[PDB]
Structure formats: C-alpha cells, structure tokens
C-alpha cells in the first residue's frame, strides 16, 4: 500500500545483489636521485 | 640440574610451610583474642554513645541466628581513626 | 626517602640512555674499521651532552596536526612506559617487589604500541599512518612469542615473581635448559624495539612529523626499552650469584652481563642487512611460533616427567 | 580522603565512560576507553585482583583496544557531544553530592555512603592468593570450560577467515 | 617413511623439529618412571592446616604426636 | 527445556562453580560459606514455592551476609550519632579509638 | 549495598545509552559495546573477589576472552562494511528497508 | 685503537650500577641494617603486622627476642 | 534480633608471647614438636566449636605452653638461639636455607641440654 | 563455502544451542549464546553481497546488546543470590533485564526491529536457521526462569509482538519479510502462555518450527523470494502450489489443520486462569496474520497469474534439489490435529 | 602506595621533559614560516592483510590469556587432567595456526 513515506522504494534485485558502486599510487619523489612513480597493490 | 634444584626447592618449601603450621595455633589464639578485644571495645563505646537514640539496643545482632559470624572490617575498625583503617584495609595490597 | 630511591633509579636510567648513544657510535665505529666520536670530549665523552643540547634547541617542525592532544600524548606515554618497566626489575633487590613482576613487564610492554599508533594518527600524512600501522603489526606480532617464551621459561620458575628468578638460577644458568627459547627470546626482543635487522622504520619513519625535542624523547624511550629488555633478559636467562650480605656482587655481575648483551645488540645491527617486511612476518608466524608452541608443550610436560615441578613460593 | 580511593577511581571510571560514550570521534572514543580501562583496572587492583588487573592491561588494553585502534586507524580516516558530556557529568556530580550529603541514595537499589573499605575480610589466606589459586584451578577443575572456550576460539579463527575473504 | 622424512628434513627443518618436540611432549610423560613422584609431591605440600581428629578410641593408623612412627612419612622425598 | 544431560550421564560439567559451598581449591572457604550451606540444606528438595516462604530467615541471613546492608546501615547510624556528639562536644573518644595504646599481641 | 557498585552499574547504563543512541559511526557503537563489557568485567571481579568465591576467579577471564572474540567478529563486520562503502557510517546500512 | 670504547662503556656501566647499589643501601638504611621484609602473601603480611605490633615503637624491623619474655 | 554475647575485657587478659616473627620462625619446629598437645586441643576445639568464644581457655593454655617453651629455651640456650634467629631475621623472605650452620648449633645445643 | 567447514560451523551452532539447553551454570548459558552467534555469522554471509553484510551487522549488534544485557542480569543475580544455578532469578531488576535480553534475542516487539531486515538480507537456508533454530535457546532459558518472570512485562511483550507482527506483514510483498513478521506474531503466541502452562509454549514452538520449515523448504524448492515469483509456480509444478496453499492456511490457524492446535491450546490454557479479554484480543489479532496468508494463497494457489515464455524451458527439467523431509514436514504441519493429546509428551 | 607515587613521578618527569622539549625552542622565534610525502592527494587505501594479521594477533592473544595460569596450575593435585588440558590448549593454538596457514591466511605478510 504505497503512501507518501514509502513512495521512493524500488524493489530489490532478483539475486539479492546490489552493484559495487582501485589501488594506491606512490610518487617516490626526488626527496643517485630518481623519481619513481609506483602503483602498488598492497 | 633443574631437576635436582627444583626437588631441593620443594623440600625447602615443605619445611617453611610446616614452620607455618607449627606456628598457626598460637597466631590463631592471639587473633581470636584480638578480634574479641576489638568487638568488646566497640560494644562498650556503642553503649556510651547510643543512649540518645530511642529504641536502640546495644550489641543487637543483625542476623537472626546465634551462630558466630566472622566480623566485618567495618565492624572492627569502625570507631577507630583513619590511619589504623588504611593500614588494615590496604596495608597488604599497597605494600611495594 | 623513597622518592630518593625513585630518583636514583630513573635519573641513572636517563644517563645510561645518553651514554648508550656514545657507546653505540664508538662500537659501530670500530666494527666498521673507522673511529667513533673522539673530537668533542676526551675520546668523545661530551658527545651525548652536545647532541642533547642540540636536539633540545632545534626548531619545532610544526605540522598542522590532525590531533594536537595525541601529538602531546604519544611521547608522554613513550617515556612513561619506558621508565615504568624498570621498577619491578630485581638487581638484586627490586624497587617495587611485586608478586607479578614478569606479567607486569609483559603488560606494560604490550601497552607501548600506542605511542607508535598515536604518533601515526597525529601526523597528517597517509604514508606515516601506513608506516605506523606496519610498525604496530610488527610489534604486536612479536609480543605473542614474548608471551609464550616467557610462560615457557616461568614454568621452571614456579611463579611470576622476578626475584624468584634468581633463586631458580643458583645452581645453573637458565639458558642451559632453555637455549632455544633463549635465542628466540633474543630475536623477539630485538624485533620488538624496531631494531636491526627489523628496523623498517629506518628503511620513511612513522614519527618524522615531531620536533627534534620530541624526537629525542622517542629516541630515549626506545633506548631505555633496549637497555631494559637486555637487563630483563640477563635477569631471566643469565642470572647471577646473589650473596645477601654483599648485594654489590649481583649488581656488578648483572651490569657486566647486561652491558655485554646490549653490546651484542650493537654488534648485531652492524652485521646483517634488513629483513623484508613479509620476511620478518614469515620468520615469526612460520618459524618462531611453531617452535614456540612445541617448546611450550615440552616445557609444560617436562617438570611432570622429571618430578621437578618448581615451588609456588 | 585516602580511604575513598576505590570510590575516586570509580568516579574517574564513570567520567571516562561519559567521555567516550558521548562519542566525539572513534579515535578519542578509544582514548577515553583506554583511560577508563586503566582506572577500572586500578579498581580491580585495589581489591587484590592483581592477576585480573594484569589480564586487563595485557589482554584488554594490550590486544583488544590495540586492535580497535588499529582498525580505527584504517577504516574511518561538537555541540551535542559536549552538551551530552556536561549532562552526564552534572548528573553524576548530583548523585555524588546526594550520596555524600546524605550517606544513602537509591537510583535503582540502595547504596551506602561510607567507604567500601568496610566490606573486606579480616583474615589471611596463608601462602597463596585466593584469586590466583582460583584461576589456577581452570585446568584441573574447569575442564569443560577450557574445552568450550578453546573450541569457540578455534571457531572464531575459522569464522574470521571465512567472512573476511570476499569470495 | 624414510625418504619422505629426509625430504621434509631437507625442505622444512623447523617444522620437523616442531612436530618432533611436540610428539615427545605428548608421549613421554606416559613412558616415564618419574611422573608418579610429581603427584606424590603435590599431594604432600602442606598448604592448609592438618586439622586433627577427635580420638574416638579406635584409630591405630593415626598418630597422637607428629614425631610418632605411624602416619605418612616423607622418607622417599628426602632420599629420592 | 532443561535437558538434564549432566545427571542422565552423571558427569560434572558445571556443577562445581555453581555455588560457593561446593568443593574449592585448597579448601578455601567463601566469606558466606556457612550461610549459603544453611540456606541450601534448608531449601533442598522442597521445591521453590515452599522454599521461598519456609526458608525465608536463612535466605535473609545469607543475603545480609552477602550485601551487608543492615550492617553498613547500623554503622552509618552509629557513626552519624557519634559525629553529632563530637560536634556538639558531648562526647570524647577513648585513646584506643585514636591509636595511642599499643595494640594487643 | 556498596558505593562502588553504584558507579559501575551507572557506567554500564551510560555505555548502554551510548550504544543505544548512535551518532555517526559503527566503530563508536563497537566501542560503546566494549565499554559495556569492561564495566561487566570490573563488576563481576569486585563481586567475586569480595565474596572470596574462589572458583569464580576464572569467570572474568572467560568473560574477557569470549567478548574479545565477539569484538574481533564485530571488527571484521565493520571492515567488510568499510570495504563496501568507503566509510563506516550507519546511514550507509539502510538498503534493507525494502 | 679498540680500547677507546671502554670509557663510554665504563660510564654507562657505572650509571647502570648506581640504581641497584642505591636501592640495596636504601633498603638496608630504612630497615635497621637488614633486607626489606618481603610480603607477597597474606601470611607474610600478618607476621609483619605482628612484628610491628610487638615491637612497641611501631616499626616491623625492630626485633624483640628472648629479652622480651620473662 | 538477639544481643551478641561477648566476653569482657578481663576475660581476654593473658601473658602474651611478645617476640618477633623471626624469633617464632626460628624456633618453629621445636615448638611444633614440644607444644603439640595444647595446640592441637585448641585447633580441634576451634574447628569443632566454630566460635572463638568457646575456645578462650584452650587459647590461654596455648599461650601458656608457648611461654613455658620459650622459658625453657631461655634458661639453657639463649646465646645460640639468638645467634640463629638474628641470621633468620636478616633475610627478607626469612629463608631457612641461608642459616644452616647456626641451625646446626642450635639443634646440637637443644638436643644435648634439653 | 568449503563443505567440511560448513559442517563444522553447523555443528558449532548446534553445540551452542545444546550448551544453552543442558547446562546448569549461567556463565555456560552465556557461553552457549556467544558460541551460537559467533558460528551463525558466516551462514548469513554465505553469498557475499552487501545486503548480507548489512544483515549480519544488524544481527551482530542486536544479539550482542542482548548478550551484554543477559550478562548484566546474571551479575545482578550473583549480587542478590551469590550463586550461579540456572533457576529462578532473585531480583525483579535482574528478571526484567533477562526478559528484555531474551526478548531481543527472540526478536519480540518492541525489540522486533531487526528481524525483517536480517531475514530479508540473507538466503532462505540461513533464514530458516534464524527463524527456527535460534528460537530454541532463549525459549529454553525462559522455560527455566518462569518462577521469576514478571507477568505484566511478558504479557505486554506478547500482545505487542502479536499486534506488530500482524500489522507488519500486511504491507509486505517479499516472502522473507512475511515470514519474519510471522515469526514475531508466533513468538508473541509462544510467550503469552509461558507463565500459565509452558508445555503449550513447547507445543507452539514445535508446531511453528514444523510449519516454518515446511514453508522455507517449499520456497527453496521453488527458488522464490517474492510474491510475484512465487505466483509462477502453477506453471512450473502445481503440487507446490497445493502445498503452500494448505501450509499457509495451516499457519493462520484454520481448522482442521494443525496450525489451529497451538493457538487453540493456548486459548484453552489462558481461560483456566480467568483471562478472557486477553486471549480474545490475541485471537482477533491473529486474523491479520491469516489475512496476509490469504493474500499469498490468492497470488499462488487459488488463481493463475500470467507467466512468461521462458517457463516452457523449465518445463523440461526435473527438480534436482534435495527437498529434505518436505513431504514429512508438510504432512505433520497439516494433518496433525486428530493427534492433539500428543502434547503430553512435552510435559 | 609506593607504586602509585612511582607511577606519578615517572609520568611527571615524562610530562616535564615533554613540556621542555615543546617550549624551550619557543623562545626561538626563528621565523614565521609558511611551509605549504610520497602520495599527493589520494585517500588511504584499505589493506585487508594488515587487518587479518591484527585479528590473528587478537585471537592468539586470547589463547595466550587462557595459557597464562600454567605456572600456578602446575601445583595442582590433579596433574593428569591439568597436563591433558594444557597440551590441549597449546594444540588448539597450533590447530588455529595450521588453519591460518593452509588456507593462505599467512600470505604476502607471511
Ligand atoms: C527419532 C526421530 C527421527 C526423525 C527422523 C530421522 C531421519 C530423517 C532426518 C535426517 C535425514 O534427512 O535423513 C534422510 C531421510 C530421508 O529424507 P528425504 O530425503 O526428505 O526423504 C525423501 C525420500 O527418502 C527420497 O528417497 P531416496 O530415493 O532418496 O531413497 C529412499 C530411501 C532409502 O532408505 C534408506 O536407505 C534407509 C536405510 C538407512 C537408514 C538409516 C540407517 C542408520 O527411503 C527413505 O528414506 C524413505 C523415507 C523415510 C521416512 C522419512 C521420515 C521418517 C520419520 C520422521 C519422523 C516421523 C514422526 C511421526 C510422528 C507422528 C505423530 C506426531 O531419511 C532416510 O534416508 C532414512 C530414514 C530412516 C527412518 C528411521 C525411522 C526410525 C527412527 C527411530
Ligand atoms: C575432545 C575432548 C578431549 C579431552 C577429554 C577430557 C579429558 C579429561 O581427562 O577430562 C577429565 C576431566 C576431569 O576429570 P577428573 O577425574 O579430574 O574429575 C574428578 C573431579 N575433579 C574435577 C574435582 C577433580 O573432566 C571430566 O571428567 C568432566 C568434563 C569433561 C568430560 C568430557 C567432555 C567431552 C566433550 C565432547 C564434546
Ligand atoms: C635538560 C637537557 C638539556 C636542555 C637544553 C639545554 C640547556 C640550555 C637551554 C637554553 C639555551 C639558550 C636559549 C635558547 C636558544 C636561544 C638562541 C637564539 O636563537 O636566541 C635568539 C632568540 C631570539 O632573538 P631575536 O629576537 O634576535 O630573533 C631572531 C629571529 N628573527 C630575527 C628571525 C626574528 O633569543 C631568545 O630566544 C632568548 C631566549 C632566552 C635566552 C636564555 C635565557 C637563560 C637560559 C639559562
Ligand atoms: C657517573 C659518571 C657520570 C659522568 C658524566 C659526564 C661524563 C663526562 C665528564 C667530563 C669529561 C671531560 C670534561 C672536560 C672537557 C674539556 C673542557 C675544557 O677543557 O674546555 C676548555 C674550554 C675553553 O677554555 P679557555 O679558557 O677558553 O681556553 C684557553 C685555555 N688556555 O673551557 C670550557 O669549556 C669551560 C669549562 C667547562 C667545563 C665542562 C665540564 C664537563 C661537564 C659535563 C657535564 C657532566 C658533569 C658531571 C656530572 C656528574 C657528576 C656530578
Ligand atoms: C593515555 C593515558 C595517560 C598515559 C600515561 C600514564 C599512564 C600509563 C603508564 C602507567 C600505567 C599504570 C598502570 C598501573 C597498574 C599496573 C599494575 C599493577 O599495579 O601491578 C602491580 C601490583 C601487583 O603485584 P602484587 O605484588 O600483587 O601487589 C602487591 C601486593 N603483594 O599491584 C599493586 O601493587 C597494586 C597497587 C595499588 C593499585 C595501583 C593502581 C594504579 C592506578 C591505576 C591506573 C591509573 C592510570 C590509568 C590509565 C593508565 C593507562 C591506560
Ligand atoms: C531521558 C533518556 C535519555 C537519558 C540520557 C540523555 C542525555 C542527553 C542527550 C539527549 C539527546 C541529545 C541528542 O542529540 O541525542 C542524539 C545524539 C545523536 O545525534 P547527533 O548526530 O550527535 O546530533 C544531531 C542531533 N540528532 O545522541 C548522542 O549524541 C548519543 C550520546 C550518548 C551519551 C550518553 C552519556 C550519558 C547520559 C546521561 C546518563 C544516562
Ligand atoms: C601430536 C603432536 C602435536 C602435533 C601437532 C602440533 C605441532 C606443534 C607445532 C606447531 C605447528 C603449527 C603449524 C603447523 C602447520 C603444518 C602445515 C604446514 O605448515 O604445511 C606446509 C608445509 C610446507 O610449506 P608450504 O606449503 O610450502 O608453505 C610455505 C612455507 N615453506 O608442509 C610441511 O612442511 C609438511 C608438514 C607435515 C609433515 C611433518 C612431519 C614431521 C615428522 C617429525 C618426526 C616424527 C615426530 C612424531 C610426531 C609427528 C606428528 C605429525
Ligand atoms: C524441544 C526441541 C529440541 C530440539 C529438537 C529439534 C529441533 C529442530 C529444529 C530444526 C531447525 C532446522 C534448521 C535448518 C536446517 C538445518 C540443516 C541445514 O543447515 O540445512 C541447510 C542446507 C544448505 O544447503 P544449500 O545447498 O546451501 O542450500 C541453499 C543453497 N542451495 O540444506 C538445505 O538447505 C537443504 C534443503 C532442505 C532443508 C530442510 C531442513 C528441515 C529441518 C527441520 C525438520 C523438521 C523438524 C523436526 C521435527 C520438529 C522438531 C521441533
């Protein structure tokens, strides 16, 4: 029975699964000398 | 080496515990006279204090039995000053 | 009178921490075929004083911290736990002769990771927070084997009392029944204190957003923990002869053994490369902990099969 | 004044609970719970529970609050906080003022107004801590308790590795 | 049983030593002639007071004085 | 339901931590061992409905041993009357209640 | 009864009302839950030491072990929630209203 | 050469020697020329309080021998 | 309820054993051998009556035989027993094992003379 | 999940419930509840979607709050009684706290606010475990402490559970929220008769577990989680529509079905004790439960909702699901009212 | 009491040296500098593996907490039961470690 309160409720997906809706980037700067721009996965 | 020395340590422990067991009846008699001294003192001073209060009976046991109940810490050191209170109630715990 | 005893404990702790830096730089000097500091004092004796007066007049580095309160409370807790580990230590008489001194030292050393964690929170950087979490994971990893090695030794003591651990070791050192626990204990105390080959904080640190004053405070808390773990290891495994009419024999003897053990820390950081982070995690969880559980079962069942259960008192 | 040391530590305990239960942030909430754990541990230590107090410092503040801070460090990063703080603080000081001017209060149950030193035992336990021997009897007497607690911790390991896998 | 054990002692010596020490700790208290003496000492350490019995008149196996010859003794513990 | 497996099998899984009067390590008694033993031996087997109104005095003595409400109330009364007499000056404490007399043993 | 039991019961009810009134986070709710456990520990310890009921001295250790395993389970749930939504706010956990 | 590390080691060893020697001398100074009475257990504390009561001058470390009985 | 029935202060007066704990622990095994029967009457009466008010006279007999024991030590072996309890009295934990030769001298003098 | 691990975890859930049942010590009751929750958390997170982690988080918070209230009730019992026997409680405040804690573990109203969310977020097998097996431990503890349960508190909880479980299931089209509000209403019925004659509490428990296991087994055999997907079952297998017809008519309390048995014996045992207004209000409120059961039967069994074309492919494949005890449970949940004096075996 | 005075003195000296180390170079003005790290502006990535080793520490710490009364439990009269349950607790700690091992829980921080 749709009221004003429960009016924006859409039904859940059929498999009870909602969509999920990255990785770290390290810029090892010059602080011999070398600037490494890493991309790490843990 | 630890076998020989821990067996010798258990023999020394038994000797010290039996020294305690040999001393225990004298310490028990002195402790019983100590607590009966303190309870008789609290009874006599409750008699000389609680004359103003109506309906008060001095020495009135809060228990319904006639069995000896081991006296509470406040039942012994109630009417005594704060130094004796602290020495008896946190003396062992605060000792180093 | 007791305040005199507290001060004569905790001021020579600070002086020994100060001159440990001189001992370390000299001894790592000669092990690296060079000389240590010998310009400042007569053979360098004025070097920790110069270094202390330098580090206490350097500019505050001033990050606009996420937390000012934890930026204050991390060195306070670091020095406080660094100095309260020393008060149950029997040498030959302890300051606070408590019934549970071993478990007290284990508890107050378990609390020492909050300086690392709060000093990672107080800095605004994400990378300092990551490094602080790596250091906390390292220290809490090795606390497990501290606890189990400590329990496995105290099954030969009978109690948690530190002063009974001299009585235990009159006929022989307790490294002779427990040398695998001794060597794993030594590496575990080496890996608690972020000491080489386990010093990945030296390989960027976690507390680099402190001033040089508070850097000296964390530094002296770390060296107080180093001298403390070595004195506690000397009491625990290499305990000495105690004559009750001359306490100075046990004091000379544990001091000589504790200096040799702290110099063994200095001689181990000057010999080996650093472990990789997962390699010291491997060294703990897959190498020390199976042996520590196996020797814990062995040290439970051994005073029962030899009729040598130690006394409680 | 010194005869009320357990009461003073209990007041600091309640003040810390109003401090972090008003929830300023999980970081300062953990800080308030660590201060509260230390002072409640002091309450335990002043009754002769030395081993249970060191269980607090080694296990509670040593493992569990370390893991709570370790998770707060990597899974999260006013007027109502301070108002609810002074609400709880003034209600606690009203209770203490009542029970000290009156020596008897009843919020839900009746409470004494003297020091809780009065309720101790006047004896000696010989050559053993009774709390230590009661914990030492976890192995000889408490066999079923040790069985179900070890099974619960093994199942805890299995459950954590299941639900924290993503697959 | 002989080549597998040499193979695992070449690959993983830490775990082989761990399982061997754990197996010794499990089996060896059941094979020992000294496991009885631990029990005999722990039941002969006097933590409590040996509360005396009222002499009812028929007790030939309870002493009347501690130095009397009847009663349990600790000759075996002094000697071992 | 209460499936009494521990009595059907006759194993003691948790009957031993159940009461204070049970078998203790090193025969250490509780502070209210005798009170609880008397309440249990009074109210045993007669069921709870008769036990709550026929062993009322033993249970009141045991609860009063546990919480000591009447005892602390009595000591509050005595100390309050004594403080009134000290403040009015109508009473003075003897030297064995000020600590001047070299206690007994 | 004793005066310290007032403070420890009031501490449990304070951390209860902290748990029963969320502000923003789930971690603050877990900290309120473990404050509740801590107050239960201290209260059980004071009763068990005060009565000299010796065999219950092992009971607060069992309480601490079980509820710390419970707290580890809750931290794991919070970590999965934080992996899903980036934060640990409770207003992200409202997908089961319909 | 190598024996120059020994002045710093000597100063550090004296600074580690000071607290143990100091607490030994303070425990003998504040206890009548004896060791501090160790009371880990309540029976030891009961005997120590008994010494403090029988000593007369309210110090557990004042011993009263057979000169105190008749 | 009832009035608790306490003995008066004259009823509790007795000659005390006014010696230290190290003096007691040094002479302890000879005490437990020689003062057997009143000590065991007192502890049997103490565990059976479950009341110190019903045990005061046995406690006085204990406190009498203890003083008789120390009188008989004082008349014949004062100096070796003093040399022994001083050595027991030095230690913190009051060890017996630090004091074997003084114990041997006291045991020899007691076995010969008493 | 690994099948060895899943068997171990289910044995741990069962072991926790058995430890609550068979033990005489309050700490072991609390250990059984802790072990039960600790082991049931992965059964909800078997599918690894954010709805199940949200459901597990809400379940954790409610059951942990109830566990802490339960331990506080135990500790106040130790204050006022000095002992640990699982028997009557010796304080009305401890009785209130333990009744509140067990009401939170049962999900009885006004603590009912977790049961449809946690039931909806998780699959049908874990929902079956939640709505049947997790009722056995708190109802056993309530069976053991009934000499101390406050009358007005448990009756307020019972009628409030019945009314809110009646009005909650009317608006629902999801099947699992219908079963959760069914659970709230039936726990109200079970705890209403607890202080009068708790054998009828055990009877209502057993008949409810049989009916709920029948309905969840039918929902698993048809793989339906909504009303509108349940409504295609006549075009797939009409015998399942017949079984959900007779079982949903059973659960509302229609004779001659055995779901009339529990509420009729409850009404019978509350009229002995001079309560007449209360079982009449309870019976009249149960008509709302029967109303949304009739709505489910209208959508499934009595009419034929239009299906789609792809049902023609599912016509060709037989059901290879292990429908465990589904004919046995469906027979026991419908035709057991001629065996109504069987309830004496529960005495 | 000696212990509380000692804790107070240690905390006071620590707070004193912190106050000196924060307020001794506040005499030094030196400048009012503006002063505007590897990563630039990324949010803290969560690492699952650090949390797994934290919970592994917590559960093994609880098993250690169960193991801590063993030096006192050795003094019991029931030694067969005590030895069985001590070996059983250390064996459950080993089983927890082996399940942590073989299901790849101790990986990449081994
Ligand atoms: C005490 C309480 C006992 C409760 C019942 C216990 C068993 C059922 C629960 C466990 C379970 O799931 O077992 C599988 C279960 C089958 O469940 P299902 O798969 O849903 O049934 C569909 C067909 O079985 C599908 O057939 P199939 O092709 O897979 O294989 C044929 C199979 C082949 O059978 C065999 O292989 C049997 C030989 C091995 C038996 C076990 C030996 C150990 O035959 C059967 O199993 C026939 C069905 C058996 C009857 C099921 C219900 C039993 C009674 C339940 C309680 C009734 C209470 C009435 C009270 C009324 C008043 C209140 O049982 C069996 O396989 C064996 C049943 C043995 C009955 C013993 C009765 C005496 C007990 C005392
Ligand atoms: C898996 C279980 C492995 C250990 C089995 C029990 C070990 C043991 O000897 O326990 C004896 C111990 C102690 O036996 P006991 O002989 O020392 O007991 C005499 C009584 N007291 C305690 C006062 C000395 O426990 C029991 O007998 C009862 C508790 C455990 C019973 C078995 C539980 C099995 C659970 C299966 C699920
Ligand atoms: C206990 C362990 C060791 C503790 C530390 C060592 C003990 C000695 C500490 C004091 C050292 C001297 C004072 C701090 C340094 C002052 C140097 C400085 O920059 O001075 C210029 C500063 C400021 O000079 P300014 O006003 O010209 O500012 C220069 C900066 N500009 C131009 C950019 C604005 O002077 C001071 O801060 C004076 C401080 C007090 C001097 C000493 C007081 C007595 C101490 C005894
Ligand atoms: C348990 C043991 C603990 C020991 C801890 C301390 C270890 C180190 C001890 C001291 C070592 C040697 C000290 C002397 C170093 C050299 C000082 C010196 O000679 O300085 C010369 C300098 C300039 O002289 P000037 O007159 O200008 O030159 C023209 C000369 N024709 O003139 C000056 O610099 C002025 C004079 C300064 C004197 C400083 C002395 C050193 C102070 C160190 C601090 C610690 C002191 C001891 C504390 C513990 C004992 C209480
Ligand atoms: C972030 C906050 C601020 C951080 C910086 C400052 C705090 C951190 C550093 C200090 C930590 C304090 C820890 C205090 C308790 C330590 C445990 C303890 O006291 O154990 C020793 C002893 C047990 O041994 P035992 O021999 O049985 O006792 C003598 C009787 N025979 O027990 C005793 O001897 C008992 C003596 C009496 C009771 C002592 C209680 C001390 C006060 C309680 C803690 C106060 C601080 C609270 C916060 C701490 C940090 C979490
Ligand atoms: C009467 C029943 C309640 C008794 C305690 C009342 C204490 C005073 C607080 C009243 C409510 C204040 C409030 O705003 O509560 C909601 C608040 C969460 O909301 P928040 O996001 O902080 O603020 C936005 C406004 N909704 O919630 C919170 O901030 C929760 C804080 C709880 C801390 C409780 C501390 C003790 C309170 C006194 C003892 C009980
Ligand atoms: C009954 C006594 C108690 C027994 C159980 C408790 C043991 C106490 C010590 C605690 C150990 C905790 C951890 C145990 C985990 C065992 C599983 C394991 O580690 O398997 C992996 C390993 C190969 O390693 P991998 O898979 O490559 O992993 C990377 C590391 N290199 O695989 C291997 O290395 C193979 C391991 C299995 C074979 C070991 C054989 C040892 C034989 C020793 C001599 C006989 C001793 C008698 C008792 C034997 C008991 C098995
Ligand atoms: C006083 C009372 C004392 C106690 C007495 C006994 C009480 C009984 C309480 C019953 C509780 C039932 C709990 C749920 C079933 C337990 C077994 C289990 O875990 O089954 C789940 C399992 C998972 O299989 P899976 O492939 O994962 O399915 C989903 C994805 N396809 O497998 C499945 O999902 C298979 C599908 C069918 C499952 C049907 C299970 C029916 C169980 C109830 C039988 C009838 C009740 C017994 C008699 C009355 C007892 C009160």
Coordinates of N, CA, C and O and ligand atoms in Angstrom, one line a residue, chain C residues 15 19 22 40-42 44-49, chain H residues 10-12 14-15 18, ligand 4:
Chain C
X15 N 70.8 8.7 32.2 CA 72.3 8.9 31.9 C 72.8 7.7 31.1 O 73.7 7.9 30.2
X19 N 74.6 7.9 27.4 CA 75.9 7.4 27.0 C 75.8 6.1 26.2 O 76.8 5.7 25.7
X22 N 76.7 7.1 22.8 CA 78.2 7.2 22.6 C 78.8 5.8 22.5 O 79.6 5.6 21.6
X40 N 84.9 15.6 20.4 CA 84.2 16.6 21.2 C 84.7 16.5 22.6 O 85.1 17.5 23.2
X41 N 84.7 15.4 23.3 CA 85.2 15.2 24.6 C 86.5 14.5 24.6 O 87.2 14.3 23.5
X42 N 87.0 14.2 25.7 CA 88.2 13.3 25.8 C 87.8 11.9 25.4 O 87.2 11.2 26.2
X44 N 85.5 11.5 23.2 CA 84.1 11.6 22.9 C 83.1 11.7 24.0 O 81.9 11.6 23.7
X45 N 83.5 11.8 25.2 CA 82.6 11.8 26.4 C 81.6 12.9 26.4 O 80.6 12.8 27.1
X46 N 81.9 14.0 25.7 CA 81.0 15.1 25.7 C 80.0 15.1 24.5 O 79.3 16.1 24.2
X47 N 80.0 14.0 23.7 CA 79.2 13.9 22.6 C 77.7 13.7 22.9 O 76.9 14.4 22.2
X48 N 77.2 12.9 23.9 CA 75.8 12.9 24.1 C 75.2 14.2 24.7 O 74.1 14.5 24.5
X49 N 76.1 14.9 25.5 CA 75.6 16.2 26.0 C 75.5 17.2 24.9 O 74.5 17.9 24.9
Chain H
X10 N 82.5 2.3 30.4 CA 82.7 2.4 31.9 C 81.7 3.4 32.5 O 81.2 3.1 33.6
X11 N 81.4 4.5 31.8 CA 80.5 5.5 32.3 C 79.1 4.9 32.3 O 78.3 5.0 33.3
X12 N 78.7 4.2 31.2 CA 77.4 3.5 31.1 C 77.3 2.4 32.2 O 76.2 2.2 32.7
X14 N 78.8 2.3 35.2 CA 78.6 3.0 36.5 C 77.2 3.5 36.6 O 76.6 3.3 37.6
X15 N 76.7 4.1 35.5 CA 75.3 4.5 35.6 C 74.3 3.4 35.7 O 73.2 3.6 36.2
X18 N 74.6 2.2 39.5 CA 74.1 3.1 40.6 C 72.7 2.7 41.1 O 72.5 2.7 42.4
Ligands
LIG4 C1 78.9 8.5 36.9 C2 79.7 9.4 36.0 C3 78.9 10.3 35.1 C4 79.8 11.2 34.2 C5 79.0 12.1 33.3 C6 79.9 13.1 32.5 C7 80.9 12.4 31.5 C8 81.9 13.4 31.0 C9 82.7 14.1 32.1 C10 83.6 15.2 31.7 C11 84.7 14.8 30.7 C12 85.7 15.9 30.5 C13 85.3 17.3 30.7 C14 86.2 18.4 30.1 C15 86.2 18.6 28.6 C16 87.0 19.7 28.1 C17 86.6 21.0 28.8 C18 87.7 22.1 28.5 O1 88.8 22.0 28.8 O2 87.2 23.2 28.0 C19 88.0 24.3 27.7 C20 87.1 25.5 27.5 C21 87.9 26.6 26.9 O3 88.9 27.1 27.8 P1 89.5 28.5 27.6 O4 89.9 29.0 29.0 O5 88.6 29.3 26.8 O6 90.8 28.3 26.7 C22 92.1 28.9 26.9 C23 92.9 27.9 27.7 N1 94.3 28.4 27.9 O7 86.5 25.8 28.7 C24 85.3 25.4 28.9 O8 84.7 24.7 28.2 C25 84.7 25.9 30.2 C26 84.6 24.8 31.3 C27 83.5 23.8 31.1 C28 83.6 22.5 31.9 C29 82.7 21.4 31.5 C30 83.0 20.1 32.1 C31 82.1 19.0 31.6 C32 80.7 19.0 32.0 C33 79.9 17.7 31.6 C34 78.5 17.5 32.3 C35 78.5 16.4 33.3 C36 79.4 16.7 34.6 C37 79.4 15.6 35.6 C38 78.0 15.3 36.2 C39 78.0 14.1 37.2 C40 78.8 14.4 38.5 C41 78.0 15.3 39.4

